[PDB]
Write a protein that binds this ligand. Structure first.
Ligand SMILES: C=CCSc1nc2ccc(NC(=O)CCC(=O)O)cc2s1
Ligand SMILES: C=CCSc1nc2ccc(NC(=O)CCC(=O)O)cc2s1
Ligand SMILES: C=CCSc1nc2ccc(NC(=O)CCC(=O)O)cc2s1
Ligand SMILES: C=CCSc1nc2ccc(NC(=O)CCC(=O)O)cc2s1
Lengths: 330, 330, 330, 330
């Protein structure tokens, strides 16, 4: 054989992949995650899982054909979760998506029923994995993945408000003519209608914008900065109305989270975690707060100082999410 | 204003972009080209053009929302080609796209008609850009772009067989247990069914595979390596069958070409250019041969030494394209 | 003749680079800046200049020999400034360096004399460039370079406190178990002994550290955070004491600034610019304040809101610098 | 208190990196390896080891101070090898290096004595690591490390001719006006004066330069291409003459090998390995041949087909090295 004529093999055993990522779901979100992760060189193996065999195999093949231009030497796929074995991170993007005029919270029963199947099959093969939830309603579903998986809370993460804050900072940058990297600002709470812009923390170069205009973000704001948060809240729906779905932004957001996890960076991101104990919250609610994200998931939470109004709004977001948790049928 | 108490302005500027790229067509191919370019930090401004307003705006906004995660500070879109002004590189992906069970050659008149509108508009606003044609059939559409634009031929480049060679190197590498980067070999001619694998040149570490198996790539080949080229030819058809189109691999191939162009690398790529006065060809056929690709587009062609068979197959490819090309209305 | 047998030349070669960087000085700082810039793919051409013939040729060759692992297709050097033609960014690292126990301010007369030769030669061949001053004392020498060059002040930038701030942020993250990217804080003023830590802006996720502990940065501070600023002031001297010189940190800090310039990012950096008209300063003092940096250099300055303490300290740093700059002759 | 006021900790992690790299030796070569590995984001922890306490700590700090600009969240150093624990890859650059005019082979006993300390200490703290030997004479010291470590031969790799080949392709590219990524050719055998350029494999785009010029590489060659290989051989002596040592190219070359290892690429590199069973070699000789480099080190060897004279040159390199190798004391 030509291979043996050309190459002498010196070593048998192949070990476990060392930095494997899995993406569950090959819709537009799932594939945007995949291409983003491949192009950031975060994984030595990428596995894709879905339920539609042709579509899955075709996406797999299309990525494989780009391997020359990549540094991720094994791309594989299957309907069977055995393909996800020894993942360090499994990203769950599967489920129904919200339509125009439909709240993300309306997706809960459909996506809960899917997670009942996906979650036990995912965790079965990957003892070292972190679960990153992207499907919506992401907060509720992070809680659901946590209850179904039986994982510790540090390993179950929701993409949460990482994108909402990315949008906030993009919009802020456009208003100030500064790059989003140098515009700082946190959108916390539900990834959805009840998110909370933390005006008290919005700053360029450590300069609090609120200290320059104490009316910032209030109805009395002459420059109507609240509308930036409104744009944040409406963004998914505005993009859905225009092109049918969203994909690129969330892909890049999830790829940012994946980088912090895979590279043990311990950067702070506003992502879905349990907040029992903070502010007024006495229940097992998941929502976005600033979390330190590393190789073991969320190891620490930053305790953001909130004005009484900000805290009220965050507790309100938490009440909304808890109300839907009480609807969950396990 | 808030901005003005925060920031002391010292320069009005405006400022032209210095590394601008435009993508024409926000279909799946075009947006894959866009995401791969954004993720390779090739451009300081990306402009998108297409004719369906809402689709276009929504793709732009979706990309814009990921700006925090990118290093391309200006992303813009319009139907109006004034948005393309001062591009260094304009990538045209627009037009009818290959359908299931049909040759790329079946798209040719409709895409000629569309290029009759697109190219003068591109030329008008960026008269010194490089044009990179990706729309199918890419070899004829590169010839067409060149005739309509009036550009010298160095500045009119077709994505050609960069992808087919990438696929071939992937498949070869999968056979040999070696990364595609270390598996060398060229598919030339048509980006389509008459492509030519240059078996004479296929090698690993400088070791000609043909020197270990003289029958390599022929009917007489015990290991039927010819099937690897057959897989390259069929790839698009299979991927289209499975997922409806191809996007990721072409996006990555186009970004690779954009990289050589934008960074003046003078790497060699098998890409579409005028072959008049090669291999005994007296017409203005465009097809892939190995080209040195740089800031001034295609500056040089590597004269591949083809066997009589390979030369035969290459002239057959040229004849096939000339036979479609000569009967066009334009 | 081998080249011509291999390659058909299709296009006359005129040698115009589009993203050229020059580094003046091939000492340890200059070669650090060079390698860091080469590894961030910022330039399509790197020129080196110095006055020691052998050292210059050796350094160039050693870089050149790594070209396969890089994407900078041309690396050149000369004593003659014609080698720097058409640079978009010129980075000045040449001059005397501080011994152990010697202030950067003591370098001023020696480095002024050198800048009287270097700066007109650079400006001669690169009329579109930005000048990035790294030579010390950087703040006075940025002023000098500005006066000599006849360039507008936006185009003459000093590396200033970009490094002091990166140190502060590193030290802070090490104290908090957070990546420096997520620890925010500014060190402004002179790149040297009179630099000003802005405690009022020090924050993680927008949470002011000084609000948690109002004693922050004072002698009364039970955790002595003032020592962090001390370590920042002492850093260069401590590293010089230990290894003979500093190189890597400043090389990275200079590559950071070059990225913002070359990619027109408009990020905010604490870098040397004219501050006359802020904080009651009336003379042409240059020092670090947070600036927006892009393709035309410093376009905007952020007016940091300072405590009376911090402001007084900044006025004193200004006074120190004018104390040396007033007497300058050239 | 401040940390605890700011952050709620969720769990006590085992820090324990997944992608730790150790560089032994912080001379010019080691630190160039460190900076290149840092800039290629290959590791989550970098450990440095040397015997000069002050220099070691200086270099560590200088790297640490640039952390803001990197993605390697822990940089440590010690004279104690406990600091190197759980490294996936240990890169040994320590030892005497060539003075001007000095053969690499003259370093041999000094560096064998140093390896007798080093290798057992490395093995002790990372018994599953891959060793990458860079210290000279690299071929013999790869053997010595293999004997002393007791590791399987797959896990003990010498940088070998990776740099010699990179130089060759640089020089070739400069001759042809093509980027060295598109110029292919292999320098094999000893990393030094007896290395063997394999002219039969030298090609652009699969076009054999020797088939265009039958006299290529011969003293009869009109264009004296042999002087390209002479240039390769002389490069380190030339650069050492000019600047006192070599650093950047070897740094880049070692990082490229680290990348193949760490990301399991299974790229092909001409690197030092036990070649017993090839080319008549009956003894445990180490020298460079093209090897498939991955996460388990060298898993496979490509069998290059050498002309009778090429093979003879290589058996020369072999005999030279085994002469010294066979009489070593440890
Ligand atoms: C219990 C019964 C069903 S188990 C189940 N596993 C999966 C996995 C992936 C996806 N994929 C998507 O949801 C992608 C959506 C899109 O096409 O945009 C759906 C499901 S349903
Ligand atoms: C009468 C008007 C003719 S001018 C014209 N300009 C464009 C520009 C872009 C696209 N975009 C696509 O073809 C979509 C791509 C896909 O769906 O794959 C089509 C056209 S038609
Ligand atoms: C009196 C007239 C002489 S003009 C002159 N041009 C240069 C250029 C480079 C350097 N190089 C360094 O100073 C090394 C850099 C460092 O070690 O920081 C010195 C000079 S002196
Ligand atoms: C006999 C037993 C001694 S054990 C020993 N461990 C080390 C570790 C590092 C280095 N460092 C260099 O060789 C770098 C020097 C330079 O290039 O400047 C030398 C040694 S010697």
């Amino acid at each position: 054989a030509l291979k043996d004529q050309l190459i002498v093999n010196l070593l048998k055993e192949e070990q476990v992949p060392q930095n494997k990522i899995t993406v569950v779901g090959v819709g537009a979100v799932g594939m945007a995650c995949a291409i983003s992760i491949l192009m950031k060189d975060l994984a030595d193996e990428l596995a894709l899982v879905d339920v539609i065999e042709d579509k899955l195999k075709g996406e797999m093949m299309d990525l494989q054909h780009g391997s020359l231009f990549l540094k991720t030497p094994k791309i594989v796929s299957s309907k069977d979760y055995s393909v996800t074995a020894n993942s360090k991170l499994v990203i769950i993007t599967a489920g129904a998506r919200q339509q125009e005029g439909e709240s993300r919270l309306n997706l809960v029963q459909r996506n809960v029923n899917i997670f009942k199947f996906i979650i036990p099959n995912v965790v079965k093969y990957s003892p070292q994995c972190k679960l990153l939830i992207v499907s919506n309603p992401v907060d509720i579903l992070t809680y659901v993945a946590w209850k179904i998986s039986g994982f510790p809370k540090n390993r179950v993460i929701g993409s949460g408000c990482n994108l909402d804050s990315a949008r906030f900072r993009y919009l802020m940058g456009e208003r100030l003519g500064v790059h989003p990297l140098s515009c700082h600002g946190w959108v916390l709470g539900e990834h959805g209608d009840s998110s909370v812009p933390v005006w008290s923390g919005v700053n360029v170069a450590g300069v609090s914008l609120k200290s320059l205009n104490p009316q910032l973000g209030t109805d009395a704001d002459k420059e109507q900065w609240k509308d930036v948060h409104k744009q944040v809240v409406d963004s998914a729906y505005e993009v859905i109305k225009l092109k049918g779905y969203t994909s690129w932004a969330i892909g890049l957001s999830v790829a940012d989270l994946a980088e912090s996890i895979m590279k043990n960076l311990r950067r702070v991101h506003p992502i879905s975690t349990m907040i029992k104990g903070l502010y007024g919250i006495k229940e097992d609610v998941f929502l976005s707060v600033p979390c330190i994200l590393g190789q073991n998931g969320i190891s620490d939470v930053v305790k953001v100082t909130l004005t009484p109004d900000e805290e009220a709004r965050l507790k309100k977001s938490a009440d909304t999410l808890w109300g839907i948790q009480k609807e969950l049928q396990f």
